[PDB]
Amino acid sequence: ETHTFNWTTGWDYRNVDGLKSRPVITCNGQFPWPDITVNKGDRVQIYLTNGMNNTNTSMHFHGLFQNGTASMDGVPFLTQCPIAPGSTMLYNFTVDYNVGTYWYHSHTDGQYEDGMKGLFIIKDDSFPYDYDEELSLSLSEWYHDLVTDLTKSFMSVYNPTGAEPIPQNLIVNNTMNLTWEVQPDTTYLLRIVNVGGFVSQYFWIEDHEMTVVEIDGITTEKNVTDMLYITVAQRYTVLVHTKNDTDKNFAIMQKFDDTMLDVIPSDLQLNATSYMVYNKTAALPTQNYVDSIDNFLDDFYLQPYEKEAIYGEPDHVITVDVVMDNLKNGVNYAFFNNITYTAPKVPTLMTVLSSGDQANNSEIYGSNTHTFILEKDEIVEIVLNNQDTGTHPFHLHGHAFQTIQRDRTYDDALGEVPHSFDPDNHPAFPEYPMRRDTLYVRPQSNFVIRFKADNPGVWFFHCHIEWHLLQGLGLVLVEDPFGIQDAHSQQLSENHLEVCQSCSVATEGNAAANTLDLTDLTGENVQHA
Numbered sequence: 001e002t003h004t005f006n007w008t009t010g011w012d013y014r015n016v017d018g019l020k021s022r023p024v025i026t027c028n029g030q031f032p033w034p035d036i037t038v039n040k041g042d043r044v045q046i047y048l049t050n051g052m053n054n055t056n057t058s059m060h061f062h063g064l065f066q067n068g069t070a071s072m073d074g075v076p077f078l079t080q081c082p083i084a085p086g087s088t089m090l091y092n093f094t095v096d097y098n099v100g101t102y103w104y105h106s107h108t109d110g111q112y113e114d115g116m117k118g119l120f121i122i123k124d125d126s127f128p129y130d131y132d133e134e135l136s137l138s139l140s141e142w143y144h145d146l147v148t149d150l151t152k153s154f155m156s157v158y159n160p161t162g163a164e165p166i167p168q169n170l171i172v173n174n175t176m177n178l179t180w181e182v183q184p185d186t187t188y189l190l191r192i193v194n195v196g197g198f199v200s201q202y203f204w205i206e207d208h209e210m211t212v213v214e215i216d217g218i219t220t221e222k223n224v225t226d227m228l229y230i231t232v233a234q235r236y237t238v239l240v241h242t243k244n245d246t247d248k249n250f251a252i253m254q255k256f257d258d259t260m261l262d263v264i265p266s267d268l269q270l271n272a273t274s275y276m277v278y279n280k281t282a283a284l285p286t287q288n289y290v291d292s293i294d295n296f297l298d299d300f301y302l303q304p305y306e307k308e309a310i311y312g313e314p315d316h317v318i319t320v321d322v323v324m325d326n327l328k329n330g331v332n333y334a335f336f337n338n339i340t341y342t343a344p345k346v347p348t349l350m351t352v353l354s355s356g357d358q359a360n361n362s363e364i365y366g367s368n369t370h371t372f373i374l375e376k377d378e379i380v381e382i383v384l385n386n387q388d389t390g391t392h393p394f395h396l397h398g399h400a401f402q403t404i405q406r407d408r409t410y411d412d413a414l415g416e417v418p419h420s421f422d423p424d425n426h427p428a429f430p431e432y433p434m435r436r437d438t439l440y441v442r443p444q445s446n447f448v449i450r451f452k453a454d455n456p457g458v459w460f461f462h463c464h465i466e467w468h469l470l471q472g473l474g475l476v477l478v479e480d481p482f483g484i485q486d487a488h489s490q491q492l493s494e495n496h497l498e499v500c501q502s503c504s505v506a507t508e509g510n511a512a513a514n515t516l517d518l519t520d521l522t523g524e525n526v527q528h529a
């Protein structure tokens with residue numbers, strides 16, 4: 001079945017918070033943006049039109065593998081060139097390899113924080129568990145200023161610390177103090193999605209246990225908890241069974257991970273209360289006080305319903321250290337090893353599709369682009385060493401990876417230093433590792449993920465904290481470029497080329513005109529020595 005949408009971006013005032021009428025990004029004049037629900041193997045065709053006066057746009061469908069259709073991933077200068085004001089890009093893709101809970105968001109500057117985001121649900125007939133009803137909750141933080149404005153003082157010489165701007169409130173389904181009307185003795189499938197741009201959240205329901213049955217599109221064995229820690233971009237789908245009494249109402253609770261906040265403003269409501277309503281007439285629940293925020297479920301120990309044994313020894317190991325540092329222009333950037341992601345003059349995919357037999361040479365994709373080439377079916381391992389004292393949720397396009405190590409917090413307040421993964425010295429990896437698309441490193445810690453390069457494409461690996469992505473915390477994976485070239489489904493459509501010309505962005509071979517293919521590029525500001 002084909003679902004066709006016609007959506008146009010725009011700006012309108014809303015008071016999402018309850019406390020500031022403020023421009024938000026609308027879809028055809030409406031807010032919030034719609035949610036898509038399709039069946040396994042359906043076709044989705046979205047005509048996105050940039051109706052904004054002065055920004056570019058894009059749309060990325062988070063978690064979808066885009067197998068055979070990399071062009072549709074929606075990452076400017078990886079997958080497409082940006083959508084210019086007035087232009088219309090057609091996103092045309094099938095959904096043959098994904099099931100469960102996903103979302104879509106703009107992949108331009110900070111755009112999605114300003115409202116351009118929505119849920120994408122794929123149903124399957126073979127979901128193992130029973131439930132009576134189903135819904136979602138979209139957790140997020142909310143700012144009173146647009147990202148464009150915050151960026152001016154975020155990426156600034158008057159911000160040498162790289163301190164990320166502090167949000168004004170937590171929101172659910174684009175309000176505060178939300179009502180969820182329930183029926184007694186009923187099992188609800190509750191999709192909890194963190195569609196925020198920055199802050200991790202703790203989530204729990206007063207006097208109700210939660211049975212985790214899916215993370216990031218991957219069905220899991222039932223795991224019961226009282227509390228979840230959800231980073232931005234991740235999804236926990238959870239079974240909740242309601243009580244027999246219609247006598248009392250219960251608090252739905254979301255809490256900031258204030259650890260991630262540079263400073264805590266004294267008036268910021270760190271924890272927000274919503275309402276699970278059994279009785280429409282009874283007392284609205286007060287805040288549910290919790291004794292500890294240290295006993296949330298560690299998703300590392302989750303067990304996929306479809307077991308896959310840990311992949312064998314890696315053919316390709318990528319080791320990256322994560323740090324924040326100041327450059328020559330005095331502003332604070334984010335680094336994978338010694339590289340801040342700096343967008344190229346020609347989108348990654350566009351150069352692979354016109355480099356012919358030189359697509360295997362890493363040099364042509366640029367030096368300041370952090371591009372790696374992955375071989376036909378090789379097992380790839382990413383080793384990430386956090387040298388920064390914060391938590392980061394890293395996300396990988398095109399794959400759900402195996403999480404084989406994710407070390408403990410190394411708290412610098414207790415005097416502890418950063419620790420890297422040591423291939424010679426580490427706990428035994430799990431036999432059947434957890435799988436997902438978005439995973440956090442703990443402060444000053446490390447993680448190791450593994451996946452098979454079985455999905456020809458161009459895939460972004462980055463921190464999903466919008467501020468850190470703006471700081472350039474990302475790298476590019478090119479999965480067998482020859483596999484990309486050989487597949488017909490992968491060739492760029494007339495519409496996409498039309499977007500590029502309308503944007504005055506080339507489809508050549510990184511800078512140079514398909515002529516020597518050895519560059520004279522676009523670099524990062526030089527180092528501080």
Ligand SMILES: *C1O[C@H](CO)[C@@H](O[C@@H]2O[C@H](CO)[C@@H](O[C@@H]3O[C@H](CO[C@H]4O[C@H](CO)[C@@H](O)[C@H](O[C@H]5O[C@H](CO)[C@@H](O)[C@H](O)[C@@H]5O)[C@@H]4O)[C@@H](O)[C@H](O[C@H]4O[C@H](CO)[C@@H](O)[C@H](O)[C@@H]4O)[C@@H]3O)[C@H](O)[C@H]2NC(C)=O)[C@H](O)[C@H]1NC(C)=O
Nearest residue numbers: 016017018019020167168169170175176177267268269270
């Ligand atoms: C859910 O329920 C919550 C709590 O009930 C509702 O939030 C309340 O909203 C009202 C109306 O928007 C707020 O009243 C306004 O208060 C401001 C001053 O606000 C400041 O001082 C407060 C007192 O300590 C403090 O609570 C505020 O903190 C909040 O805001 C900051 C961001 O600013 C945020 O980070 C925090 O997390 C808090 O949310 C804040 O520091 C006052 O200036 C307002 O305007 C008056 O004057 C002007 C005249 O120019 C006029 O426009 C108005 O009519 C008014 O006369 C107004 O009094 C109230 O502070 C909020 N209460 C709390 C405790 O947060 C929320 O709206 C509900 N959500 C929904 C339905 O979306």
Ligand SMILES: *[C@@H]1O[C@H](CO)[C@@H](O[C@@H]2O[C@H](CO)[C@@H](O[C@@H]3O[C@H](CO[C@H]4O[C@H](CO)[C@@H](O)[C@H](O)[C@@H]4O)[C@@H](O)[C@H](O[C@H]4O[C@H](CO)[C@@H](O)[C@H](O)[C@@H]4O)[C@@H]3O)[C@H](O)[C@H]2NC(C)=O)[C@H](O)[C@H]1NC(C)=O
Nearest residue numbers: 035036037119121134135136137138173178179180181191
């Ligand atoms: C926060 O925001 C999210 C949206 O982002 C809301 O999520 C939606 O919640 C509603 C329930 O409140 C869900 O609606 C239910 O969908 C079920 C399945 O979808 C079927 O229907 C459509 C038809 O176009 C097709 O996809 C296909 O037919 C599916 O089978 C239905 O079972 C429900 O249908 C209706 O009839 C039955 C009669 O038995 C009634 O019981 C229902 O109430 C209803 O009238 C129902 O429509 C919806 O799926 C959720 N969407 C998403 C994206 O998850 C949250 O509700 C909101 N949170 C709060 C508290 O407001």
Ligand SMILES: *[C@@H]1O[C@H](CO)[C@@H](O[C@@H]2O[C@H](CO)[C@@H](O[C@@H]3O[C@H](CO[C@H]4O[C@H](CO)[C@@H](O)[C@H](O)[C@@H]4O)[C@@H](O)[C@H](O[C@H]4O[C@H](CO)[C@@H](O)[C@H](O)[C@@H]4O)[C@@H]3O)[C@H](O)[C@H]2NC(C)=O)[C@H](O)[C@H]1NC(C)=O
Nearest residue numbers: 054055056081082084109345503504505521522523524525
């Ligand atoms: C949405 O719309 C487009 C999407 O691409 C953006 O417009 C482009 O912006 C980029 C950067 O964001 C521009 O790239 C820059 O070009 C500079 C000058 O190049 C011009 O001059 C030659 C002259 O022959 C032209 O051929 C060319 O088209 C340009 O007009 C470069 O100087 C910049 O790189 C580097 O400059 C300094 C100076 O030494 C170096 O030190 C650094 O390496 C630095 O990176 C840079 O590459 C591009 O020109 C813009 N227009 C296009 C492609 O038409 C919008 O920015 C975007 N809107 C927003 C903000 O959302």
Ligand SMILES: *[C@@H]1O[C@H](CO)[C@@H](O[C@@H]2O[C@H](CO)[C@@H](O[C@@H]3O[C@H](CO)[C@@H](O)[C@H](O)[C@@H]3O)[C@H](O)[C@H]2NC(C)=O)[C@H](O)[C@H]1NC(C)=O
Nearest residue numbers: 002004043044045046069090091092093094488489493495
């Ligand atoms: C949305 O994407 C799909 C996937 O490519 C497009 O469907 C395809 O459309 C093309 C041309 O419109 C079809 O090409 C035709 O192929 C036949 C043989 O199958 C050949 O005889 C013709 O000469 C022609 O080239 C292609 O078959 C078709 N595939 C499917 C799955 O239907 C679609 O066009 C895209 N755009 C739209 C309509 O929005």
Ligand SMILES: *[C@@H]1O[C@H](CO)[C@@H](O[C@@H]2O[C@H](CO)[C@@H](O[C@@H]3O[C@H](CO)[C@@H](O)[C@H](O)[C@@H]3O)[C@H](O)[C@H]2NC(C)=O)[C@H](O)[C@H]1NC(C)=O
Nearest residue numbers: 253255256268269270271272287288289290291292293294
């Ligand atoms: C936001 O949420 C947190 C967590 O719910 C709130 O902190 C909690 O505050 C309560 C009391 O205000 C603490 O309970 C105490 O527990 C001991 C048990 O030994 C008991 O003897 C005391 O009588 C008391 O009840 C609780 O520890 C504390 N939770 C944590 C993890 O610190 C916080 O107050 C909320 N923010 C608000 C409403 O301003």
Ligand SMILES: *[C@@H]1O[C@H](CO)[C@@H](O[C@@H]2O[C@H](CO)[C@@H](O)[C@H](O)[C@H]2NC(C)=O)[C@H](O)[C@H]1NC(C)=O
Nearest residue numbers: 220221222223224296297298299301302303304
């Ligand atoms: C449910 O999750 C828990 C942890 O959240 C897993 O059980 C234990 O987890 C600890 C770490 O706290 C590990 O040392 C062990 O794997 C378990 N310990 C005990 C008490 O035996 C469990 O694996 C999960 N169950 C699922 C997904 O079915």
Ligand SMILES: *C1O[C@H](CO)[C@@H](O)[C@H](O)[C@H]1NC(C)=O
Nearest residue numbers: 005006007008047048049088
């Ligand atoms: C969507 O509808 C608009 C009206 O806002 C119309 O102009 C356009 O043709 C439609 N989009 C596409 C590209 O089909």
Ligand SMILES: *[C@@H]1O[C@H](CO)[C@@H](O)[C@H](O)[C@H]1NC(C)=O
Nearest residue numbers: 246247278279280281282283
């Ligand atoms: C709702 O709660 C009130 C007490 O606040 C009670 O009087 C009323 O009967 C309840 N409604 C039902 C039918 O559950």
Ligand SMILES: *[C@@H]1O[C@H](CO)[C@@H](O)[C@H](O)[C@H]1NC(C)=O
Nearest residue numbers: 337338339340367368523524
């Ligand atoms: C850091 O990466 C390598 C390390 O040897 C070096 O060649 C390169 O110049 C540095 N990156 C850039 C281009 O800033």
Ligand SMILES: *[C@@H]1O[C@H](CO)[C@@H](O)[C@H](O)[C@H]1NC(C)=O
Nearest residue numbers: 065067068097398399454455
């Ligand atoms: C891509 O499709 C191929 C062919 O069906 C399949 O073998 C592979 O597993 C797919 N990759 C992903 C990421 O689903």
Ligand SMILES: *[C@H]1O[C@H](CO)[C@@H](O)[C@H](O)[C@H]1NC(C)=O
Nearest residue numbers: 359360361362373375376482
């Ligand atoms: C690129 O992969 C090919 C196999 O297609 C192989 O010959 C070689 O090891 C790789 N070459 C480079 C330049 O890394």
Ligand SMILES: [Cu+]
Nearest residue numbers: 062105233464
């Ligand atoms: Cu995403």
Ligand SMILES: [Cu+]
Nearest residue numbers: 061062063397
């Ligand atoms: Cu993604």
Ligand SMILES: [Cu+]
Nearest residue numbers: 392463465468
């Ligand atoms: Cu980060």
Ligand SMILES: [Cu+]
Nearest residue numbers: 075397460462
């Ligand atoms: Cu991304």
